[PDB]
Design a protein around this ligand. Structure first.
Ligand SMILES: O=C1Cc2cc(Nc3ncncc3Cl)ccc2N1
Length: 130
């Protein structure tokens, strides 16, 4: 549906999440993906704009006039690829699959990627688990 928003424009409730869903479908089909992220020898295709929109690190990389033309970006080879995969999934879905078994790897990776709200959330869940 839609609603009358604060600015008095018509606002579409599901639009942002539909856009994100459609970008994730493109990613699944490898449509218009323009970068490969390499972690611990594993490769992940993505759209630079989505990466930038979610991560301070990717924002810095792709606004650099030298690095914005790289179509392959290697990350720290100590990054847990599953940690990366979970965060990439989050970027494209809004859903973060946080578990006791993975939380430390996810949090370290989010710190490295400068994903501040994810780092905060990871912090709170650890606080509670201790
Ligand atoms: O009304 C509409 C809005 C709209 C968006 C799209 N786009 C996509 N659809 C499915 N998978 C990926 C993408 Cl990017 C296609 C048809 C229509 N029709």
């Amino acid at each position: 549906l839609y609603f009358q928003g604060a600015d008095s424009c018509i606002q579409f409730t599901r639009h942002a999440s539909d856009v994100l869903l459609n970008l994730n479908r493109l990613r699944s089909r490898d449509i218009l993906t323009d970068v490969v992220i390499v972690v611990s020898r594993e490769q992940f295709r993505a759209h630079k704009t989505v990466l930038m929109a979610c991560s301070g690190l990717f924002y810095s990389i792709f606004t650099d006039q030298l690095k914005c033309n790289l179509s392959v970006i290697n990350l720290d080879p100590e990054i847990n690829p599953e940690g990366f995969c979970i965060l990439l999934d989050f970027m494209y879905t809004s859903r973060l699959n946080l578990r006791e078994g993975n939380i430390m790897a996810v949090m370290a990776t989010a710190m490295y990627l400068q994903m501040e709200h994810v780092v905060d959330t990871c912090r709170k869940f650890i606080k509670a688990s201790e």
